[PDB]
Structure formats: structure tokens, C-alpha cells
């Protein structure tokens, strides 16, 4: 999409 | 706006997913801990349109994108990667920072061994702020939460080989063969007393600064916690002291009996600290992500890696 | 080596990189660039050739390139970001799900698809593409669509065509290794090509194997075209290319032009230069054309001189 900061 | 670099940094980070460090993570416990902490770009730094230049794709990995130039003068990037026990960024509080660096060490001094923590880097990076509330105080109540023994507090600075105790208003001291007499050790009954010792020591009107937690039972030392805020790694005699540190720390993964001194005033008084079958240490290399302070930033890291040794 | 082995080893000791799982969302990309690290070979290993490709994130690769100054030791851990980065644990289907699978969806709307592997000899290309093959899995997935009760209108006649281009001298691997002719009107179009219609995915595999059996394999590209036809009318064409070894002088200008022609696909093409750019010119025009590049590499220290160019090529194909 992109891209995503998460974990 | 240099502009073209900020273009190249963002067409990098676009394609990049990052899995940061969280409180969900386990608290690791090593011989020598090497961490790094990037501070956020301040207003005055932002107001000049300074590109952030450092990323943290994970809990440990750290990526720096440095602006290089050809002989063409073709603007370039060279993406250098670095690993550490815990790399953490803007979002990281001190509560985060204490938990992964100093927090395991409080238990260490109550054992009978002795622990020391350094924040090291460039001027205006985040050394004083990290340790100064700060890591000193954060250990204190957790030092005081753990319960017959009494606790003593030391605070002093090292400049030009001289040694000041801020506790007494500018009270010069001497170091000898290891023992520093005139050692100001105030007894505290809880964080209350200690918190008052830090700010008073800090209030005093290019220098190392050391804070100590000490334990005695019969009146005999049990555990020593030494938290140092080093000078800027950029008269140039400071270069030597920090250089010695690397060697002093290194002899602690060799479980070594022998260490070098004299050529460094800082070490001498911190010197019990680099020996024993129970001596742990953490190192905090803080950096300024402001692109036009990148050379200082790299130097701050090339010092800290492989000093896992 | 020894030394450069412990600096790396020390680095990958605190590394906590995560591995991309199949569950990971398939992205839909107009121009996808991925990198495939190849597992270490027992021969490369036997010589204790050292592993030097750190792939910590689904979207990220590293190369601890070994150079030295006083000769006091250092390591330059270099980062390259990508849409995808495959490790030595990534299966073929694993690489399929994120490169060629979404592209199958594109040909069924008359769209044009073209997908490359680009790396040195002994990097993974001609493996990693072609039952093992991205070729084979393309068909298998293609036939599945034709069966679905959603495209069964457009009564299509699956075809096949596997040819090889070598120094301007192209060759159709569908005959007795016969040669071909290429022209274009005042558009592009081949001559003599024999579109092989298949109707079993097994058909394609035994259709490919000819070119396999026929075809150093490294001075020439292998180009495989899947074409959908409804009633003899062309729908969409999918080109899968096992490129010539990227490491003989015309070859570099075949990749000069290719790289140039993937540049303008993003900007919505200097095709007339090289023969590879001529045959697949269609798949580089319009808003209907998607491409996927698999720059594949070698994990060994000796390669690092030459697999840092393949990485440098790829980084200039995302813009
Ligand atoms: N979390 C934070 N991120 C960024 N800047 C901060 C943060 N906390 C405090 N600061 C401010 O940054 C300033 C830098 O001072 P200091 O930390 O002494 O620089 P250095 O320690 O590098 O010499 C401090 O006055 C402090 O108020
Ligand atoms: N991901 C992989 N897993 C296992 N083996 C591989 C992988 N990639 C390549 N190989 C092996 O490496 C060898 C060389 O690869 P190949 O693609 O045939 O040559 P080229 O790189 O010139 O196309 C092949 O025999 C193949 O078996
Ligand atoms: Mg900015
Ligand atoms: Mg300061
Ligand atoms: Mg790894
Ligand atoms: Mg090959």
C-alpha cells in the first residue's frame, strides 16, 4: 500500500 | 532545503516496513550491553528544514542513510547498517530506556557484583537528558523498592584530570593508589533523599559526570552502581579518556585480570568496575539525526560497535 | 575467511529480523522489484565460503561488504530496500506468490505482463523461474482461472510459445531450434512463430522442456510468452524471461535498454535499440501493463564484488 510500522 | 537527499531518503523508507521495540519484549541480560538511542529533531533543528537521516527498522537494527558525493557531484546515499542490543528511537521514553539498559543492573549490585552505565556521544545528542527524571532517579526507587542494609549516594564531575564533587559546592578532590578520599557519600532512606541529591548536584553553575549508588552492610561495600554522563566525542585531551573506555570495557568480555589506567583520570575511580566474575556494563551511544551532523553521528557509532568484542 | 566471518557472526548475533510468512498480504504492484538470495551450496560451503547476505525484513536485505584500509579491521554493512526480499529459506511458490501470481490476474483483463529474473550465472535465475518453474506455476494458476465460472465467457484457447534470443539472432525453441524474423510496420510483430495451443497445465511443461532440452546457457536470454486468445483475437500476453548472465558486449546494452524501458513504464520507451526491448515493447505501454523483476544473487563472499552491482542495477529500477 505501503508500508506500515507495527510489530 | 538541499531537497534531493530528502527525496532519496523517502523513496527508501517508502519501501521499508519496520517492527520496533515494544514493552511486549523480554528483558535481556548480558555481560556488556551496547545500545543506541536516537533523539528527535528539535524545533530549531526542524525550523532549518533538516532532513531526518537515521532510521530504526527494528528493536536492534539501525540504518543510517548518509549523503555522499561523486566527483560528478552526483548526489548519493550510502546506507550503512548497525546492530545493537537495543536500538530505540524518538518514541522511546526513559521508562523504555531504563527498562532495557539499567533495569537489569539494579539486581546486579544487590548480588555482590558491581555495575556501571555510560551514555556517550556528541554534544546535544541526548546524554545529559538520558541520565539526568533520568536514569539516576529511575534506578533509585527500584533500588529502594527491593526489600538490613543502608544506601549511599555520590555525585561528581571530572575535568582536566581534576575531580569535583558537586555535592559540596566545588569541592576539589584527589585520586590515589584505588581510593578517592573526600568521597562524599550521603545516606538516603528512599528516592526522596536521592532525588534531592541529583538536582542539587546538577544545579552547579566538556566534562564527565558520575553518579553512584553504594551498598554497605557491616559498613563494608556490597554493590556499586556507577552512572556516567560522558563528554562530547567531537584541550583535545577528552579524546583519550573515551578511547581508554573502549579498552577498559573490552577487558570485561575477556574476563581479564589486567586493565590499563593512569592515561585516564575517569577510569581510575571507576576502576574496581572492570573486573570480577560479576561485573556488568551498559553503553548508550546517543545520536543527532540532523543530516548536517552525520559525521559526528557515525563516529559515535563506529566507536560502539564491535565493542561487543 | 576467518576474521570477516566473526564480525558478521557477531552482527547476526543480536539480529532479530523477521521472516516474511505466506500469510503476509499480497501487495498489488504496477512495477515490482524483489531480490532472491540463494541458499549456500555445499561446494561453496565446503570451501568455507562465508555467508554474507543478511535479510532481516520481508522488505530488506543487507551486505556486509568486506573492504579494509593500516589494515585495521572493518565491515561495511550495506542496506538495500525492496518491495520484496527472499532468503535461503524461501521456496519457489513462496517467491511465486509475490511476483508472478498477481500478474496472472492482469492478463485476464487484456493487460500486459512481463516478469524477469536478473542475476549472474549461479544466482538462481533459470532455476527460480523454470514444475519448479515460475513458468509452470504460471500455467497451473492460469488454467484454474479458465475453469472458474467467471471468465468462462470469452471462450479462450490457451496457447504457448518458448523462444530464445541470442545476439540479435533469435531462435524459436518450438522447432528444430529454428530461427526467426522480426519487423514492425510504420508496433511490433514476429514472423514464423508457432503459437502452441495447450489445454493442460501438464501440456505446457512438456512444451517448455523442448527449449530446455535444446538450449554457455549464459550468453543468451530465454523468453517465454503466455498468450490468451478468446476467438483467435488476442487478449493479453505474459512474458517470462530468464535473462542472459548479467555478469557479450551487446548484452550490457540489452540491459541498458531494458532498464531504460522499465523507467518510462512508471512515467507512462527507447525500444529500437536492443532485440529484447523490441519483442516485449507492448508490455511497456499503456496503463494496462505491469512488470515484476527478480534480481537474484549469490550468498558467497567472493560474489560480493559482483552481486553488489546486481543490487545496484535493481535499486535504479524503482523510481
Ligand atoms: N526525549 C527527548 N528527545 C529530544 N530532546 C530532548 C528529550 N528530552 C529532553 N530533550 C532536550 O534536549 C536538550 C539537549 O540537552 P542535552 O541532553 O544536555 O544534550 P547532550 O546531552 O547531547 O549534551 C535538553 O535540554 C533536553 O531538555
Ligand atoms: N533458491 C534456491 N534453492 C536451491 N537451489 C538453488 C536456488 N537457486 C538456485 N539454486 C541452484 O543453483 C544452480 C544455479 O542456478 P541456475 O538458475 O540454474 O543458473 P543461473 O543463475 O545462471 O540461471 C541451480 O542448479 C540450482 O539448482
Ligand atoms: Mg523534516
Ligand atoms: Mg551535555
Ligand atoms: Mg540473518
Ligand atoms: Mg542459468
Backbone angles phi, psi at C121, to 5 degrees: -65, 135
**Any bridge partners for residue B33, and if so which?**
B282
CA atoms within 13 A on the CB side of B15: 22
What was the structure determination method? X-ray
Listing DSSP states for C240-256 in one string gives EEEPPP----HHHHHHH
- Residue C122 near ligand 2, beta carbon < 6 Å: yes
B307, B34 Cβ separation under 8 angstroms: yes
CA proximity to C50, closest of C238, C260, C300: C300
- Which long-range contacts (C-beta less than 8 Å, at least 24 apart) are formed by B248-257? B248/B274, B249/B32, B249/B274, B249/B281, B249/B283, B249/B307, B249/B309, B250/B307, B250/B309, B251/B275, B252/B31, B252/B32, B252/B279, B252/B281, B253/B31, B253/B32, B253/B308, B253/B309, B254/B309
Counts of helices then strands in chain A (DSSP H, E): 0, 0
What 3-state DSSP class applies to C53? coil
Q: Degrees (nearest 5) of the Cα angle C95, C101, C104? A: 150
What 3-state DSSP class applies to A5? coil
CA proximity to B86, closest of B26, B130, B35, B30: B35
* Cα–Cα separations (whole angstroms), residue C310 to B144, C123, C295: 58, 10, 7
Rounded CA separation C77/C152 (Å):
52
Rounded CA separation B219/C59 (Å):
57
Q: How many folded domains does chain C comprise?
A: 1
CATH number at residue B206: 3.40.850.10
**What ligand has the least distance to the C-alpha of C13?**
5
* The C-alpha cell that represents B76 in the structure block: 548519493
**Any bridge partners for residue B81, and if so which?**
B63
* Cα–Cα separations (whole angstroms), residue C198 to C148, C155, C236, C295: 17, 14, 16, 30
- Quote the domain boundaries for residue B73: 1-309
CA proximity to B241, closest of B208, B269, B273, B274: B208
Total residue length of chain A: 7
How much of chain A is in helix, strand and coil states, percent to nearest 5?
A: 0, 0, 100
* The C-alpha cell that represents C220 in the structure block: 543468451
Listed in sequence order, the residues at least 6 apart from B140 whose beta carbon sits closer than 8 Å to its beta carbon are: B191, B194, B195, B213
Q: What is the distance in A from the centroid of ligand 2 to the CA of C39?
A: 9
Rounded CA separation B76/B178 (Å):
52
CA proximity to C244, closest of C257, C231, C235: C257
B148 annotated to bind ligand: no
B61, C15 Cβ separation under 8 angstroms: yes
Listed in sequence order, the residues at least 6 apart from C147 whose beta carbon sits closer than 8 Å to its beta carbon are: none
Rounded CA separation C132/B67 (Å):
42
Judged by a CB distance cut-off of 8 A, whether residue A5 touches chain B is: yes
Rounded CA separation B104/B106 (Å):
6
Q: Quickly count: other Cβ atoms within 10 Å of residue A6's Cβ.
A: 9
* The C-alpha cell that represents C133 in the structure block: 518453474
Chain C residues lying within 8 Å of A2, measured CB to CB? 27
Residue nearest to atom 24 of ligand 2 (CA): C127
DSSP class of B272:
G
End-to-end CA distance of chain C: 37
Judged by a CB distance cut-off of 8 A, whether residue A1 touches chain B is: no
Helix or strand run (H / E) with residue C43: helix C42-46
Rounded CA separation B298/C10 (Å):
19
Q: What is the distance in A from the centroid of ligand 6 to the CA of C243?
A: 8
Rounded CA separation C233/C205 (Å):
24
| DSSP strand pairing (C234-242 vs C112-117) | parallel
Yes or no, beta carbons of C78 and B83 under 8 Å apart? no
Q: Degrees (nearest 5) of the Cα angle C101, C288, C160? A: 55
Amino acid at each position: 500500500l505501503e508500508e506500515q510500522a507495527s510489530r | 532545503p538541499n531537497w534531493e537527499f530528502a527525496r532519496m531518503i523517502k523513496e527508501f523508507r517508502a519501501t521499508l516496513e519496520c517492527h520496533p521495540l515494544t514493552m511486549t519484549d523480554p528483558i535481556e541480560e548480558h555481560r556488556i550491553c551496547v545500545c543506541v538511542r536516537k533523539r528527535p529533531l528539535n524545533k530549531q533543528e526542524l525550523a532549518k528544514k533538516e532532513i531526518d537521516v537515521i532510521s530504526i527498522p527494528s528493536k536492534c537494527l539501525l540504518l543510517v542513510h548518509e549523503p555522499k558525493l561523486k566527483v560528478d557531484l552526483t548526489k548519493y546515499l550510502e546506507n550503512q547498517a548497525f546492530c545493537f542490543d537495543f536500538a530505540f528511537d524518538e518514541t522511546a521514553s526513559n521508562e523504555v530506556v531504563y527498562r532495557f539498559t539499567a533495569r537489569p543492573l539494579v539486581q546486579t549490585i544487590f548480588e555482590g557484583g558491581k555495575a556501571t552505565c555510560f551514555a556517550y556521544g556528541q554534544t546535544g545528542s541526548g546524554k545529559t537528558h538520558t541520565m539526568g527524571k533520568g536514569i539516576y532517579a529511575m534506578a533509585s526507587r527500584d533500588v529502594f523498592l527491593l526489600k538490613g542494609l543502608e544506601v549511599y549516594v555520590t555525585f561528581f564531575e571530572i575535568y582536566n584530570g581534576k575531580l569535583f564533587d558537586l555535592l559540596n559546592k566545588k569541592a576539589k578532590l584527589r585520586v590515589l593508589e584505588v581510593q578517592v578520599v573526600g568521597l562524599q557519600e550521603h545516606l538516603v532512606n528512599s528516592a526522596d533523599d536521592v532525588i534531592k541529591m541529583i538536582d542539587m548536584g546538577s544545579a552547579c553553575r566538556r566534562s564527565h559526570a558520575c553518579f553512584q549508588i553504594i551498598l554497605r552492610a557491616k559498613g563494608r561495600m556490597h554493590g556499586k552502581f556507577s552512572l556516567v554522563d560522558l563528554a562530547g566525542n567531537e584541550g583535545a585531551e577528552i579524546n583519550k579518556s573515551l578511547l581508554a573506555l573502549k579498552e577498559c570495557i573490552r577487558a570485561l568480555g575477556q574476563n581479564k585480570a589486567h586493565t590499563p589506567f593512569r592515561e585516564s583520570k575517569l577510569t581510575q575511580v571507576l576502576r574496581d568496575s572492570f573486573i570480577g566474575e560479576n561485573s556488568r556494563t551498559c553503553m548508550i551511544a546517543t545520536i543527532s539525526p540532523g543530516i548536517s551532523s552525520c559525521e559526528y553521528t557515525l563516529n559515535t557509532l563506529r566507536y560502539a560497535d564491535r565493542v561487543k568484542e
